[PDB]
Design a protein around this nucleic acid. Sequence first.
DNA 1: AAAGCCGGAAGTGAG
DNA 2: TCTCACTTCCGGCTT
Length: 92
Amino acid sequence: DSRLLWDYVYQLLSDSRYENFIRWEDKESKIFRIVDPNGLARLWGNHKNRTNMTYEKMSRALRYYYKLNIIRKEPGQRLLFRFMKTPDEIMS
DNA sequence: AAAGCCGGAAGTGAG
DNA sequence: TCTCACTTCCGGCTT
């Protein structure tokens, strides 16, 4: 479960030490913003012990989350996203 | 122009 | 050995 991207994103959003890579913008509405796409892509590649992980490839995994309706693009600003399901709902 | 964002399609490490 | 959750590559379209 820890290897899953939605689990990793939730863990970073709850740890204030990562506020400069990813952060809540409307925590009540599950709206978050990716602050450092290149830096966030390195944390993800390290998290899965992978090599040559890029944000171009990570964002494709986020677009894969578009199709599963886990997250969606929020139109307010660039790199803004919204969780459409809670962690309990994704595991359901 | 260049960089970013998109989705279709095939590839793959790990559990 | 097989499948899952991405991963890898890319043409096409935005910004």
